[PDB]
Enzyme design. Structure first.
Site, PDB file in Angstrom:
ATOM      1  CD  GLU K  84      -3.191   0.580   0.450  1.00 34.93           C
ATOM      2  OE1 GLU K  84      -3.316  -0.778   0.201  1.00 34.93           O
ATOM      3  OE2 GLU K  84      -3.966   1.317  -0.098  1.00 34.93           O
ATOM      4  CG  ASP K  85       2.233   4.798  -2.341  1.00 35.99           C
ATOM      5  OD1 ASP K  85       2.528   4.724  -3.480  1.00 35.99           O
ATOM      6  OD2 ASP K  85       2.581   5.703  -1.817  1.00 35.99           O
ATOM      7  CB  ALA K  86       4.279   1.890   2.955  1.00 31.71           C
TER       8      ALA K  86
END
Ligand SMILES: [Zn+2]
Ligand SMILES: [Zn+2]
Lengths: 49, 317, 145, 68, 95, 49, 48, 49, 45, 48, 343
Positions: K84-86
């Protein structure tokens, strides 16, 4: 263009006949088109590229 | 519940299958082959090399005067990062200060270094040449100026091996005329898992020995191409009176797993690259502290010790 | 900074790029009671515009699922035990004394469990006290071709 | 600012390995391969003393105690 | 508290969960490897609740004959003998 | 291309007293300061008043 | 509203789908009442 | 109308500005305010609407 | 009395409280304070 | 070119002048442009 | 926009994000910081030149003003946290000095405003004739009501000491920031032309901000993320050479964003760092006949590594190799500015 590229190099600088910044605005004619008036603009506060 | 009956533990058979050879050993770098050891033990040796074994490093820094450009916390940090040459087992651990905090230093626990430099103008300079090494005296605050201060008994404890900085040429800060740095760094023992500056060995890692085997022997100019793909030395073009040119794998240890061939359209049939599952190729480059021999020995020592610890604390129950 | 699980994410509609969420704490016991019972995360498993599930596992977990369920994957004893245990994590969640496993799908000449066998092993070790086994047939996403 | 002692990825020390790198480009007419003579074989510890801005020598010319 | 038995242990002490504190995969993995060389063990896998807090959940299921504590004891002795063989060969290598 | 470093370091140690090293930043700021110069010279305020 | 904090939020797969992380600052600072009875006196004793 | 025009970067670092100062901002109370360029209709050019 | 620095000329000016602040030679109107000898500790983290 | 000349109706070998004059007639008005773009996007989505 | 390498390989929304978000990097706002009384300044202790740089990036002379660092980013979904884009951050690099931010908050104190009206100039800085508290005042504030240079301040503690003349009792103003800050310089702003008292102080507090979980980072294509877990250094993957990748980006983030330009940047960086080149990455150079990928790949296979950019990496916690190879590049991670104040 000619007088400007002359003004850069060797040829001495007289008052510039046509200033480089000038954008000669030829508006061609065409049906249902933008109204044609030759537009020789010479003012500052414009954009030039 | 299924055991396969060939996974039985046997110390004699294990010890017999195990083989070690040391390719190269210097004062800094060491490259050696372990074999007959399952992956997890290699992972453990690597971990203990990097993380678990202790080594002195500058923990606290007492500045008495610092008007330099470098931020004060930055300067303390960067001083802490430098490495120090002292056999970390000559000391004890640092009992960390809970409330009641001041009286927590002893001669066995911590060692003190001190530096002070005030950059004063140098007037002998003829013209303007902002070296600045020549315009100013004491311009660059080096590492080598961190001159150790003996604390009592230590003056005779480490008389044979002075507690000095590893590299006398590291840069710690930079000065110009007028400003000064003056501080003393308290160095204690540390365990790399807490912070990286403790870890003695910079770079310790292994490779599973690659395996190159030619299915169908290549010919002629393809021999040139095949020699050219892998780096030099690992691919010889065989002097065979039959035919004109072939290629065989001399010594793969130098090779990288790079997998350049498998991209070629015509080679993909002819060669595979696999991996000998129980041959492990360690490389260990120290930083400034200890001969890597002692590093690996003490690493397996530390595994032994932690196993003793869990063994005893179990024996209690 | 607080920490949540991937699953709930698709509900709150966050990308976790650095967006922030209010955490509240109901003081009294009536409020926290009704909250814990009516609104416990799992008890909101069906978004109420339609019936379809709004939670779920996501990106890494799903493509690694396509890599674990695939028939080309075989595990030995060591990896199977380790993986099953990492999946369960009993003690912190609780509820169980000792884990039960399945026999190996292929046995000789080396004992190699298969992946779908591990998904079944999980489905087993979460079986309720006495509930008859699941059965299901339904179309997958990745077409077979 | 100053050279980042103990390069990020690996653990090699490169503090002292800039003032002897700079006087290679300076007077050896060599290219970026100069750093190879310094004993940097990886490419983590090599993107440190190659592409590091020594932005202190432009900042130390700001003493308030100039006395001038 | 280095090693403490978590509260799920069967009365027979046949399925116990050791919990070694201040440790990460470094010992967990190798100890699991050495234990799996032991035939009388049925299940031995290690985990970590949360890497921030350094607690390693171990777990051993054994055969009814020998309890799991003796299994762990023998496994640790065996790991020590493994390190003994390694140091023996190693220190033989160089002068 | 190659990292201009020896030029960078030599411009750092002793700043160039001849001409501002990177002229195109000045050609980027040119609009505002040139409007103000045209205020003072080139007779802008005078015509207005 | 009182008793309600706020932060930017990172992900964690290890906790649960039920559970949520709480940093130490929110724990130590977010308070709520607890009546004291016969059988959880021990816990409140330790607490204070 | 400032005391920095044409000053070479040495004379700037000898003062308290940074070498490649670009200038162009009115200073007011110490927060460098600036006049954003706006966009206007074309000068003198009789357009239709 | 304290010790300061002329911002422009850089001269110790030794001004006493309730005074006309100015550089006693420059005429400048800004003074920095100077860092004295002080014992501060910072962890190497 | 094929799709556009087809929508306006002229052949592929058409005179350039008449082609341009037709096109000029096309996008002063705006609804004919919606027709043209429907046809053009049709052929292009086919190619895609 | 020009100085975003391979700006012509990205889906224009992402080039737009990277443009609008590069204008807020925690980078070096210049070099003259001793004499800047601006309110909030950010300085990135250790920035360095991008290994991939469009030659105009040298022509405009940015090298004076670097923005971020160069991280060995291994595209891999291994930690499990980085979805999730982290992303992740190799702890050893995080403690050996990765983007080590320093905030400057210069707050000013002005006795001129607080006087009511009527009576002449009254209040002054310092310790009025009379006693002063020992416990914190005399610890921090030197003698002049101006605080000790460099003493560490905690929220509940004075920064300036001023007294009314009538009551003659020293007042106090404490450091209303809620985070341990330092003090670098205090400026006694003289009033005017001259002949006045010190009626304004300017204290420049130097807050320190290392990368804390939540401090957004960003490549130069729009991949703003979060430092999620600061994964330990020994539990990270590693290659046949030994370099732990410093920052792990997530694979599931490249489709649905079209930042293939970033993969190209990875190739270019691993090429540039090896030989000692500065890979020219202006937009529109590399045409369809020969791909940029092919040119950088020729470079790499020269250097020794794989030609698609791949590299074989053994995992950290199990010790066995990853079945499939992994991608390792050298990207430029211009750290962002949203860490703790906002949060
Ligand atoms: Zn390195
Ligand atoms: Zn003065």
């Amino acid at each position: 263009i000619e007088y400007a590229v002359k003004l850069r190099n060797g040829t001495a600088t007289e008052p510039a006949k046509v200033p480089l910044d000038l954008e000669i605005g030829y508006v061609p004619p065409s049906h249902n088109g933008q109204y044609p008036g030759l537009y020789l603009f010479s003012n500052p506060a414009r954009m030039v590229r | 519940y299924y055991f396969d009956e060939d996974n039985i533990w046997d110390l004699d058979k294990f010890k017999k299958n195990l083989k070690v050879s040391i390719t190269s050993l210097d004062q800094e770098t060491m490259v050696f082959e372990i074999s007959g050891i399952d992956a997890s033990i290699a992972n453990a040796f690597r971990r203990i090399l990097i993380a678990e074994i202790p080594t002195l490093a500058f923990e606290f820094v007492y500045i008495i005067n610092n008007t330099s450009i470098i931020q004060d916390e930055v300067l303390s940090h960067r001083i802490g990062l430098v490495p120090i040459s002292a056999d970390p087992d000559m000391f004890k651990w640092f009992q960390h200060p809970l409330p009641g905090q001041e009286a927590t230093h002893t001669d066995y626990d911590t060692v003190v270094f001190s530096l002070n430099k005030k950059c004063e103008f140098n007037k002998n300079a003829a013209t303007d040449e902002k070296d600045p090494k020549r315009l100013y005296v004491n311009s660059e605050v080096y590492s080598g100026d961190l001159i150790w201060k003996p604390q009592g008994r230590q003056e005779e404890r480490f008389a044979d091996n002075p507690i000095r900085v590893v590299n006398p040429d590291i840069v710690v800060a930079k000065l110009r005329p007028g400003q000064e740095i003056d501080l003393e760094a308290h160095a204690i023992l540390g365990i790399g898992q807490d912070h990286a500056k403790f870890s003695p060995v910079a770079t310790a890692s292994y490779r599973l020995l690659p395996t190159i085997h030619i299915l169908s022997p290549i010919e002629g100019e393809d021999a040139v191409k095949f020699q050219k793909c892998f780096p030099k030395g690992v691919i010889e073009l065989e002097e065979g009176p039959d035919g004109k040119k072939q290629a065989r794998v001399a010594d793969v240890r130098k090779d990288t797993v790079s997998r350049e061939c498998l991209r070629h359209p015509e080679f993909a049939d002819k060669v595979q690259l696999g991996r000998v599952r129980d041959h492990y190729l360690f490389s260990v480059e120290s930083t400034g502290i200890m001969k890597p021999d002692v590093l690996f020995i003490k690493s397996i020592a530390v595994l032994k010790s932690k196993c003793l610890a869990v063994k005893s604390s179990l024996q209690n129950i | 900074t607080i920490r949540m699980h991937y699953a709930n994410c698709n509900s709150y509609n966050a990308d976790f790029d650095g967006d922030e969420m209010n955490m509240h704490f109901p003081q009294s016991t009536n409020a926290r009671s009704e909250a814990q019972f009516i609104a416990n995360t799992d008890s909101q498993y069906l978004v109420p515009t339609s019936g379809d599930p709004l939670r779920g596992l996501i990106q890494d977990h799903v493509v690694m699922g396509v890599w674990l369920t695939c028939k080309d994957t075989f595990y030995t004893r060591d990896e199977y035990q380790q993986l099953l245990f990492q999946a369960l994590k009993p003690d912190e969640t609780g509820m169980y004394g000792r884990i039960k496993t399945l026999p190996p799908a292929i046995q000789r000449p080396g004992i190699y469990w298969t992946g779908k066998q591990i998904i079944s092993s999980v489905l087993l070790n979460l079986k309720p006290s006495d509930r008859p086994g699941l059965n299901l047939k339904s179309k997958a996403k990745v077409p077979g071709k | 600012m100053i050279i980042p002692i103990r390069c990020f990825s690996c653990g090699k020390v490169i503090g002292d390995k800039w003032d002897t790198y700079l006087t290679l480009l300076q007077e050896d007419n060599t290219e970026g391969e100069a750093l190879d003579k310094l004993g940097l074989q990886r490419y983590c510890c090599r993107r440190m003393i190659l592409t590091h801005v020594d932005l202190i020598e432009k900042l130390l010319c700001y003493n308030p105690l100039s006395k001038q | 508290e280095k090693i403490i038995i978590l509260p799920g242990h069967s009365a027979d002490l046949t399925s116990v969960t050791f919990q070694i504190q201040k440790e990460d995969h470094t010992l967990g993995n190798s100890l699991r490897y050495v234990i799996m060389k032991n035939p009388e063990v049925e299940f031995c896998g290690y985990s970590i609740p949360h890497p921030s807090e350094a607690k390693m959940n171990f777990r051993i299921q054994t055969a009814p004959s020998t309890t799991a504590v003796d299994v762990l004891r023998k496994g640790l002795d065996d790991l020590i003998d493994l390190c003994d063989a390694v140091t023996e060969k190693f220190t033989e290598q160089l002068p | 291309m190659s990292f201009q470093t020896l030029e960078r370091e030599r411009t750092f140690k002793n700043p160039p007293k001849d001409g501002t090293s990177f002229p195109d930043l000045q050609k980027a700021v040119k609009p505002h300061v040139d409007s103000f110069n045209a205020l003072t010279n080139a007779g802008l305020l005078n015509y207005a008043v | 509203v009182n008793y309600a904090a706020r932060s930017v939020i990172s992900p964690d797969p290890n906790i649960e789908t039920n559970e949520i992380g709480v940093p130490p600052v929110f724990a130590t600072k977010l308070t709520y009442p607890e009546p004291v009875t016969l059988y959880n006196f021990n816990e409140m004793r330790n607490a204070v | 109308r400032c005391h920095l025009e044409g000053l070479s970067p040495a004379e700037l670092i000898a003062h308290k500005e940074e070498s490649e100062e670009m200038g162009g901002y009115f200073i007011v109370n110490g927060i460098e305010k600036l006049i954003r360029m706006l966009i206007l209709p074309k000068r003198n050019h009789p357009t239709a609407i | 009395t304290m010790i300061y620095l002329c911002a422009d000329c850089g001269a110790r000016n030794t001004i006493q409280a309730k005074e006309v602040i100015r550089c006693r030679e420059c005429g400048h109107r800004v003074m920095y304070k100077m860092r004295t000898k002080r014992m501060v500790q910072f962890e190497a983290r | 070119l094929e799709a556009a000349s087809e929508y306006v109706g002229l052949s592929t070998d058409s005179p350039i002048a008449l082609l341009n004059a037709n096109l000029e007639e096309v996008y002063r008005d705006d609804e004919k442009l919606q027709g043209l773009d429907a046809a053009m996007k049709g052929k292009m989505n086919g190619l895609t | 926009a020009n100085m975003t390498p391979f700006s012509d390989f990205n889906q224009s929304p992402r080039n737009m994000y990277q443009c609008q978000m590069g204008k807020q990097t925690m980078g070096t706002p210049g070099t003259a910081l001793r004499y800047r009384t601006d309110n909030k300044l950010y300085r990135l202790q250790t920035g360095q030149t991008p290994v991939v740089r469009p030659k105009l990036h040298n022509t405009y002379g940015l090298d004076h003003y670097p923005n971020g660092t160069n991280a060995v980013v291994a595209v891999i979904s291994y930690t499990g946290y980085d979805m999730e884009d982290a992303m992740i951050l190799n702890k050893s690099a995080h403690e050996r000095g990765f983007g080590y931010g320093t905030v400057y908050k210069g707050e000013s104190f002005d006795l001129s405003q607080k006087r009511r009206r009527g009576e002449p100039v009254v209040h002054h800085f310092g310790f009025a004739p009379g006693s002063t508290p020992r416990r914190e005042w005399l610890q921090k504030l030197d003698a002049d009501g101006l605080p000790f240079i460099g003493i560490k301040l905690e929220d509940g503690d004075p920064i300036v000491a001023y007294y009314d003349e009538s009551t003659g009792q020293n007042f106090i103003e404490t450091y209303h920031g809620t985070e341990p800050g330092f003090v670098d310089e205090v400026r006694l702003l003289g009033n005017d032309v001259g002949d006045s008292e010190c009626q304004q102080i300017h204290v420049k507090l130097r807050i320190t901000r290392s990368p804390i979980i939540g401090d957004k980072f960003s490549s130069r294509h729009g991949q703003k993320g979060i430092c999620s877990q600061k994964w330990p250094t020994v539990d990270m993957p590693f290659t046949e050479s030994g370099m732990q990748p410093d920052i792990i980006i997530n694979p599931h983030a490249f489709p649905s964003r079209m930042t293939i330009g970033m993969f190209i940047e990875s190739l270019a960086g691993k090429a540039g760092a090896c030989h000692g080149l500065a890979q020219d990455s202006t937009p529109f150079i590399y045409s369809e006949q020969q791909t940029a990928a092919d040119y950088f790949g020729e470079q790499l296979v020269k250097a020794g590594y794989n030609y698609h950019g791949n590299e074989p990496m053994y995992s950290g916690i199990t010790g066995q190799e990853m079945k499939a190879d992994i991608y390792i590049g050298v990207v430029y991670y211009q750290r962002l500015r949203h860490m703790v104040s906002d949060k």
